[PDB]
């Protein structure tokens, strides 16, 4: 629904999967399919796991798909204030100029 049509094929496409919770196993069955489909569209996904309850397994599964899908894992939400600078630096490194 978001990237249904790539109307800016020259622009980089990135998603922050900021995540802090598990999900029941029955709902995780098509996870790899969707992340691989996003890769085929070259939609980058940067997982940002926060807290002890973050689904680290899904994070590593995302990381396995592509090197640019590198993960951030945070102790708590307040660590976002510390990680923000390098997060934006990485995002703009992943994007081309005009």
């Amino acid at each position: 629904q978001i990237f249904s049509k790539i109307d800016r094929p020259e622009a980089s496409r990135i998603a922050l999967l900021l995540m802090a919770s598990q999900e029941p196993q029955r709902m995780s069955r098509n996870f790899v399919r969707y992340v691989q489909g996003l890769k085929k569209k070259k939609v980058i996904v940067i997982p940002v796991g926060i807290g002890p309850h973050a689904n680290l397994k899904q994070i590593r599964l995302i990381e396995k798909q592509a090197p640019e899908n590198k993960a951030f894992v945070l102790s708590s939400v307040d660590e976002l204030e510390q990680q923000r600078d390098e997060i934006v630096s990485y995002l703009c490194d992943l994007a081309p100029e005009a």
Partner: protein, 99 residues
């Protein structure tokens, strides 16, 4: 050693409020101490409380006050009659006959 009591020591690692402090204070030594005091325990879940309290105080020393650790856990640090335990009490508490 008892699994149900051991969960209480694992609170140091699993709970979000304590997870704030991991960048500053490694919980593993406190978890081991908590496990062996549970082995020494002669009561209920409260036997894990000294380790949690000391971990919270160490974190407060390092800079992070864990405002909510007393609510998530089953612990309740002892206070004199009528007074509530609270993190980050100002030392200049207001007595009536005070300027």
């Amino acid at each position: 050693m008892q699994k149900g009591l051991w969960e209480q020591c694992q609170l140091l690692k699993s709970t979000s409020v304590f997870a704030r402090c991991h960048p500053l204070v490694d919980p593993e030594p406190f978890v081991a101490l908590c496990e062996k005091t549970l082995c020494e325990c002669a009561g209920g879940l409260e036997c894990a409380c000294p380790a949690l309290l000391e971990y919270a105080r160490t974190c407060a020393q390092e800079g992070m006050v864990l405002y909510g650790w007393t609510d998530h856990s089953a612990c309740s640090p002892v206070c004199p009659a009528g007074m509530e335990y609270r993190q980050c009490v100002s030392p200049c508490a207001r007595t009536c006959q005070s300027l």
